[PDB]
UniProtKB/Swiss-Prot annotation:
Keyword Kinase attached: no
Modified residues (N-formylmethionine): 1
GO-annotated molecular function: electron transfer activity; iron ion binding
Binding site for Fe cation: 6, 9, 39, 42
Record organism: Clostridium pasteurianum
GO biological process: alkane catabolic process
Name of this chain's protein: Rubredoxin
PANTHER family the record matches: RUBREDOXIN, RUBREDOXIN-1-RELATED
Cofactor annotation remark: Binds 1 Fe(3+) ion per subunit.
Pfam family, one: Rubredoxin
Family: Belongs to the rubredoxin family.
Gene3D superfamilies assigned to the protein according to its UniProt record, in alphabetical order: 2.20.28.10
PROSITE patterns per UniProt: RUBREDOXIN, RUBREDOXIN_LIKE
Function statement: Rubredoxin is a small nonheme, iron protein lacking acid-labile sulfide. Its single Fe, chelated to 4 Cys, functions as an electron acceptor and may also stabilize the conformation of the molecule.
Amino acid sequence: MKKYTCTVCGYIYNPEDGDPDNGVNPGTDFKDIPDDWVCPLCGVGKDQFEEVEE
Ligand SMILES: [Fe+3]
């Protein structure tokens, strides 16, 4: 829950929005995101994501 950083490129993930365009429905917790999922426009993979305190 809450938003999250990428790691370096600068693509903050928002769970309330999800990333449905990429395959992650809205309301998907960053933890629940499949490890097969990757940054929308960056090539690294979900790792070392800091929580964004909205
Ligand atoms: Fe990225």
